Amino acid sequence: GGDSEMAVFGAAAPYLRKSEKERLEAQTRPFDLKKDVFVPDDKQEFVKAKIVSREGGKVTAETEYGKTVTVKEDQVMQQNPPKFDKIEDMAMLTFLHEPAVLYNLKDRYGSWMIYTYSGLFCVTVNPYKWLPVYTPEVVAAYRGKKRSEAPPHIFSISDNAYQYMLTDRENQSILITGESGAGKTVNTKRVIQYFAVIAAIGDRGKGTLEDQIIQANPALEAFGNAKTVRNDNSSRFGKFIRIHFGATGKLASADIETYLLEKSRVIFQLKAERDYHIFYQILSNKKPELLDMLLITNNPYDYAFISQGETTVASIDDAEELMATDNAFDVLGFTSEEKNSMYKLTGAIMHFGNMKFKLKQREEQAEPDGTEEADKSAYLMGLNSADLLKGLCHPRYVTKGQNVQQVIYATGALAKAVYERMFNWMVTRINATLETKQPRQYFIGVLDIAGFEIFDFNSFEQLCINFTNEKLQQFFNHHMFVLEQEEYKKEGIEWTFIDFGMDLQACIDLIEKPMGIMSILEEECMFPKATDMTFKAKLFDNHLGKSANFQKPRNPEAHFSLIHYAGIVDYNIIGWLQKNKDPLNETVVGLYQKSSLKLLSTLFANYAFQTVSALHRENLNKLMTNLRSTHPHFVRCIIPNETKSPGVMDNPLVMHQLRCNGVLEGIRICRKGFPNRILYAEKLLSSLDIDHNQYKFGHTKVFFKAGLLGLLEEMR
Numbered sequence: 001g002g003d004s005e006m007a008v009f010g011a012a013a014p015y016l017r018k019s020e021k022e023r024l025e026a027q028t029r030p031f032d033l034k035k036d037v038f039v040p041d042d043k044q045e046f047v048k049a050k051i052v053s054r055e056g057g058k059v060t061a062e063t064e065y066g067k068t069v070t071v072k073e074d075q076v077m078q079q080n081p082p083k084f085d086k087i088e089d090m091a092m093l094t095f096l097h098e099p100a101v102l103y104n105l106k107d108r109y110g111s112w113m114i115y116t117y118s119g120l121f122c123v124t125v126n127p128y129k130w131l132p133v134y135t136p137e138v139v140a141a142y143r144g145k146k147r148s149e150a151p152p153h154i155f156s157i158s159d160n161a162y163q164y165m166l167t168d169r170e171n172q173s174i175l176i177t178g179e180s181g182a183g184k185t186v187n188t189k190r191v192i193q194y195f196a197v198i199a200a201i202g203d204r205g206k207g208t209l210e211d212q213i214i215q216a217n218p219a220l221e222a223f224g225n226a227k228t229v230r231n232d233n234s235s236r237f238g239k240f241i242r243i244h245f246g247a248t249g250k251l252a253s254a255d256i257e258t259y260l261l262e263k264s265r266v267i268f269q270l271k272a273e274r275d276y277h278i279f280y281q282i283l284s285n286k287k288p289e290l291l292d293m294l295l296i297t298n299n300p301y302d303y304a305f306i307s308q309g310e311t312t313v314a315s316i317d318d319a320e321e322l323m324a325t326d327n328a329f330d331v332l333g334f335t336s337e338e339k340n341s342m343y344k345l346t347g348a349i350m351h352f353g354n355m356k357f358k359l360k361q362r363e364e365q366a367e368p369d370g371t372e373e374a375d376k377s378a379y380l381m382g383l384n385s386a387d388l389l390k391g392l393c394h395p396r397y398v399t400k401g402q403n404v405q406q407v408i409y410a411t412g413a414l415a416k417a418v419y420e421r422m423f424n425w426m427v428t429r430i431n432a433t434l435e436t437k438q439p440r441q442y443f444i445g446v447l448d449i450a451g452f453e454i455f456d457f458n459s460f461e462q463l464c465i466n467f468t469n470e471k472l473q474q475f476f477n478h479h480m481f482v483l484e485q486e487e488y489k490k491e492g493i494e495w496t497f498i499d500f501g502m503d504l505q506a507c508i509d510l511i512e513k514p515m516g517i518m519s520i521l522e523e524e525c526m527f528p529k530a531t532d533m534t535f536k537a538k539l540f541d542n543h544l545g546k547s548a549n550f551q552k553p554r555n556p557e558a559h560f561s562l563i564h565y566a567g568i569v570d571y572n573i574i575g576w577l578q579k580n581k582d583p584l585n586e587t588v589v590g591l592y593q594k595s596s597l598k599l600l601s602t603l604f605a606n607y608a609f610q611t612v613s614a615l616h617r618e619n620l621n622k623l624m625t626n627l628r629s630t631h632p633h634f635v636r637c638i639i640p641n642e643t644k645s646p647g648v649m650d651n652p653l654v655m656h657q658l659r660c661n662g663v664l665e666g667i668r669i670c671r672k673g674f675p676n677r678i679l680y681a682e683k684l685l686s687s688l689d690i691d692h693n694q695y696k697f698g699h700t701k702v703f704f705k706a707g708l709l710g711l712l713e714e715m716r
């Protein structure tokens with residue numbers, strides 16, 4: 001029958017492509033081109049409306065949601081015909097404005113169809129519901145197929161990447177970005193799982209490389225993931241996995257790079273948030289020997305660093321995860337000594353935050369107020385209690401005093417530093433397991449980081465990640481430019497414009513260049529006299545006249561605006577110097593270096609310097625060099641709502657993501673050329689009062705400037 005092309009997907013079909021019956025019925029639905037449109041809306045960005053009247057200047061209409069609106073004609077936007085309902089590749093739409101895109105994804109999502117292409121982009125909308133589309137039957141059905149030969153699916157990106165690698169003898173890249181809760185990690189896991197399922201086996205820790213690559217997740221997640229408002233299993237670090245292959249797709253090796261762990265979370269949680277999972281995994285009591293080994297109770301509320309917000313989360317069984325974490329470490333080849341050391345240090349951070357301090361009666365100086373929790377920290381860290389507390393009270397050379405606030409601050413900074421270093425070391429250790437003697441030719445790199453971030457409060461962390469997405473969006477634009485070029489060249493159309501990647505340089509230069517934002521930040525970090533306001537003066541003095549992308553802040557207090565590709569972002573500048581330098585109590589670091597616990601010693605052997613900014617620049621450069629040696633593939637994750645509600649879509653929220661993630665950006669840059677291209681000659685066009693500069697003739701197709709087809713199918 002008409003659906004025979006879908007038969008191989010079995011029960012997954014209703015979630016991949018709607019049947020031919022539904023297709024032809026949708027096509028007969030009542031549709032007047034002139035009446036059925038999109039207009040702007042206050043509460044819900046855009047809304048499908050039916051035109052009731054014209055003014056001669058304005059238009060009034062009947063809103064979906066049952067309202068009457070009066071708008072300027074300029075604001076009215078045409079709907080795509082029923083022919084285009086739930087289209088699989090949105091580049092094939094006649095009208096490619098904001099509403100057209102939003103509604104095509106909304107109609108797919110309403111129908112439980114989670115995957116859509118938009119030129120190069122695979123777009124994924126979080127279902128918040130398990131769908132039967134990740135079965136062996138679906139895997140079998142994607143093997144060796146081209147994009148156009150199967151409905152949209154994350155499996156298509158995976159299989160094609162693997163196939164491109166073998167066919168073109170070339171590194172591949174899968175960039176999976178989006179907001180917190182969008183689905184980045186779910187899709188990342190599917191992609192890795194897919195390679196492990198299909199990759200060839202190469203010549204002969206525990207089990208197989210496939211086992212080990214996958215078991216890397218439960219290990220990182222315990223220490224790097226946490227409950228946030230947005231996401232029960234939020235990744236609080238960016239991740240880049242290169243899976244290496246040999247000649248015929250033999251799984252050869254893998255390596256993991258992690259970026260910008262959230263040190264703050266170690267010691268602080270907002271009302272509705274938790275610390276990293278591991279703390280609650282250990283406290284679940286599932287492994288009773290750990291409470292005794294860590295000198296700890298089962299009550300998170302006994303521990304100040306980890307109980308400032310939430311403690312439990314219904315979706316997570318912390319006890320089962322502890323066994324998941326521990327198993328992972330076993331599979332990954334970690335020794336008892338190595339596992340116990342990380343548990344000990346986790347426990348030590350727990351006790352560290354319970355050290356209380358008081359003022360000397362006749363002095364403005366801090367002393368310990370009880371020392372039991374200090375004793376437990378020192379024993380676990382292989383340190384001397386007295387030395388530790390001496391160090392914290394009287395940092396040493398010349399000897400400085402400390403009030404309680406200073407010691408409490410120093411305590412928190414040290415705990416964060418220890419946690420961060422442990423996480424890095426763990427990643428380094430997993431890399432040792434994943435290293436093999438097997439021969440490599442190519443890799444496929446999978447990137448899982450948060451996309452572009454515009455919050456109510458934007459600080460240093462936001463600048464860093466927004467800087468990354470600028471380079472990633474440029475990377476996309478450049479790739480898009482090369483493809484559009486090959487295409488105009490192949491079909492024989494002389495086209496001219498500057499590299500699409502260049503459109504992002506001015507912003508990047510402002511951030512990246514010598515005497516740019518990062519450089520000014522790092523130069524100020526050299527001066528002990530420098531302050532937040534001296535830093536803010538220095539940026540302004542260098543840029544407010546000179547760099548168009550640097551502006552006054554629009555009126556939570558912000559200090560300057562950056563014009564990014566994704567919009568104008570206001571930045572708060574308080575604390576950037578400290579964030580960047582991360583000064584520690586050197587006397588206590590000296591003790592860490594001399595610890596009887598091998599791990600602690602290791603974590604501080606190589607110690608200041610390198611600022612957060614310069615480390616970020618070093619990592620981003622490495623990333624970009626890898627990605628540039630690569631055929632890239634682009635996966636855009638979208639979160640549909642704030643309430644975890646399956647099949648429900650908030651329009652302004654999806655619209656915000658589309659503006660920030662490249663989907664609208666890609667549409668915009670293709671608009672510079674001739675986006676609509678249809679296969680068949682020149683006499684018919686020359687026989688119309690139509691604007692003659694709006695079209696060009698190619699070998700296979702005729703190329704149209706956007707809006708010609710709009711006026712062509714209209715006349716039809």
Ligand SMILES: Nc1ncnc2c1ncn2[C@@H]1O[C@H](COP(=O)(O)OP(=O)(O)NP(=O)(O)O)[C@@H](O)[C@H]1O
Binds near residue numbers: 179186231637
């Ligand atoms: N394809 C899917 N099917 C079913 N549930 C999903 C899917 N994608 C995401 N989810 C749900 O959404 C949650 C969060 O997705 P996840 O991949 O962790 O988001 P993320 O983009 O990594 N956000 P973050 O890591 O915080 O930046 C998951 O735990 C699932 O419950």
Ligand SMILES: [Mn+2]
Binds near residue numbers: 185233234
């Ligand atoms: Mn994640």
